[PDB]
Protein backbone atom coordinates (compact mmCIF):
# COMPACT_ATOMS: atom_id res chain seq x y z
CA UNK A 1 0.00 0.00 0.00
CA UNK A 2 1.15 3.38 0.20
CA UNK A 3 3.57 3.35 3.46
CA UNK A 4 6.50 5.42 4.78
CA UNK A 5 10.13 4.37 3.22
CA UNK A 6 12.02 7.02 4.53
CA UNK A 7 11.87 9.73 7.82
CA UNK A 8 12.90 12.76 6.12
CA UNK A 9 12.64 15.60 8.94
CA UNK A 10 11.26 16.63 11.81
CA UNK A 11 8.96 19.82 12.11
CA UNK B 1 15.53 -9.64 3.90
CA UNK B 2 14.92 -6.28 3.23
CA UNK B 3 12.30 -4.71 1.98
CA UNK B 4 11.91 -0.68 2.41
CA UNK B 5 9.00 -0.88 4.00
CA UNK B 6 10.31 -2.95 6.63
CA UNK B 7 13.64 -1.35 6.82
CA UNK B 8 11.26 2.29 7.78
CA UNK B 9 9.87 0.10 10.48
CA UNK B 10 12.95 -1.53 12.31
CA UNK B 11 15.15 2.08 12.30
CA UNK B 12 12.41 4.37 12.99
CA UNK B 13 9.48 2.43 15.16
CA UNK B 14 9.49 2.60 18.79
CA UNK B 15 5.15 1.80 19.71
CA UNK B 16 6.29 0.10 23.16
CA UNK B 17 7.30 3.64 24.74
CA UNK B 18 5.99 6.97 24.61
CA UNK B 19 9.03 8.55 24.89
CA UNK B 20 12.96 8.15 25.74
CA UNK B 21 13.32 7.27 29.46
CA UNK B 22 16.78 8.40 29.59
CA UNK B 23 20.35 9.33 28.48
CA UNK B 24 20.88 6.10 27.72
CA UNK B 25 17.66 5.32 25.26
CA UNK B 26 20.06 5.51 22.32
CA UNK B 27 22.61 3.88 23.37
CA UNK B 28 20.65 0.25 23.49
CA UNK B 29 18.11 1.32 20.69
CA UNK B 30 20.50 1.33 18.03
CA UNK B 31 22.42 -1.35 19.42
CA UNK B 32 19.00 -3.46 19.37
CA UNK B 33 18.13 -2.29 15.72
CA UNK B 34 21.18 -3.07 14.93
CA UNK B 35 22.26 0.11 13.56
CA UNK B 36 26.21 -0.29 15.42
CA UNK B 37 26.81 -3.71 13.45
CA UNK B 38 28.88 -2.88 10.75
CA UNK B 39 29.41 0.71 12.02
CA UNK B 40 28.02 3.48 13.72
CA UNK B 41 25.10 4.99 12.29
CA UNK B 42 25.58 8.43 12.89
CA UNK B 43 21.75 9.74 13.03
CA UNK B 44 18.23 8.37 13.90
CA UNK B 45 15.20 9.15 14.66
CA UNK B 46 12.85 6.97 16.60
CA UNK B 47 9.00 7.91 16.78
CA UNK B 48 7.34 6.39 19.99
CA UNK B 49 3.83 6.22 17.84
CA UNK B 50 2.30 3.41 16.72
CA UNK B 51 2.77 2.00 13.44
CA UNK B 52 -1.25 2.67 12.28
CA UNK B 53 -0.21 6.37 13.08
CA UNK B 54 2.71 6.53 11.83
CA UNK B 55 1.65 4.95 8.35
CA UNK B 56 -0.89 7.54 8.28
CA UNK B 57 0.90 10.71 7.73
CA UNK B 58 1.39 9.21 4.07
CA UNK B 59 -2.44 10.65 3.74
CA UNK B 60 -1.43 13.58 5.55
CA UNK B 61 0.44 17.20 4.25
CA UNK B 62 1.93 16.86 0.63
CA UNK B 63 5.38 19.11 0.67
CA UNK B 64 8.12 18.77 -1.53
CA UNK B 65 11.50 16.54 -0.39
CA UNK B 66 14.99 18.12 0.26
CA UNK B 67 15.63 16.40 -2.93
CA UNK B 68 12.92 17.92 -4.96
CA UNK B 69 11.08 14.54 -5.15
CA UNK B 70 7.09 15.43 -3.86
CA UNK B 71 6.63 11.94 -1.99
CA UNK B 72 6.49 13.53 1.40
CA UNK B 73 4.37 14.03 4.06
CA UNK B 74 4.10 16.25 6.87
CA UNK B 75 1.94 14.94 9.86
CA UNK B 76 -0.45 17.77 10.92
CA UNK B 77 -0.25 16.74 14.45
CA UNK B 78 3.31 16.50 16.66
CA UNK B 79 4.65 13.03 17.28
CA UNK B 80 6.50 11.86 20.37
CA UNK B 81 10.58 11.39 18.65
CA UNK B 82 13.71 10.70 20.19
CA UNK B 83 16.74 11.97 18.21
CA UNK B 84 19.73 9.84 18.38
CA UNK B 85 23.21 11.24 17.35
CA UNK B 86 26.76 10.10 17.24
CA UNK B 87 28.78 12.04 20.12
CA UNK B 88 32.25 13.18 19.00
CA UNK B 89 33.73 10.41 21.35
CA UNK B 90 32.14 8.11 19.76
CA UNK B 91 34.26 5.06 17.49
CA UNK B 92 33.90 1.96 16.11
CA UNK B 93 32.63 -0.45 17.66
CA UNK B 94 32.05 1.63 21.47
CA UNK B 95 29.51 3.61 19.31
CA UNK B 96 28.36 6.74 21.43
CA UNK B 97 24.99 8.76 21.34
CA UNK B 98 23.19 11.51 22.83
CA UNK B 99 19.19 10.68 22.99
CA UNK B 100 17.32 13.90 22.17
CA UNK B 101 13.27 13.83 23.36
CA UNK B 102 11.20 16.29 21.43
CA UNK B 103 7.54 16.04 20.45
CA UNK B 104 7.55 17.56 16.57
CA UNK B 105 6.17 17.18 13.45
CA UNK B 106 7.47 14.26 11.27
CA UNK B 107 7.92 14.23 7.94
CA UNK B 108 8.05 10.92 5.58
CA UNK B 109 8.53 9.55 2.19
CA UNK B 110 6.14 7.57 1.28
CA UNK B 111 5.83 4.49 -1.65
CA UNK B 112 2.93 2.76 -3.23
CA UNK B 113 4.75 -0.69 -1.22
Known sequence: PYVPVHFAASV | ?113
Open chain 2, 1 to 113: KETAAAKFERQHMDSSTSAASSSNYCNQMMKSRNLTKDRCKPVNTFVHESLADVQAVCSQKNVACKNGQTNCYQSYSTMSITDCRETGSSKYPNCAYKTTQANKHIIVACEGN
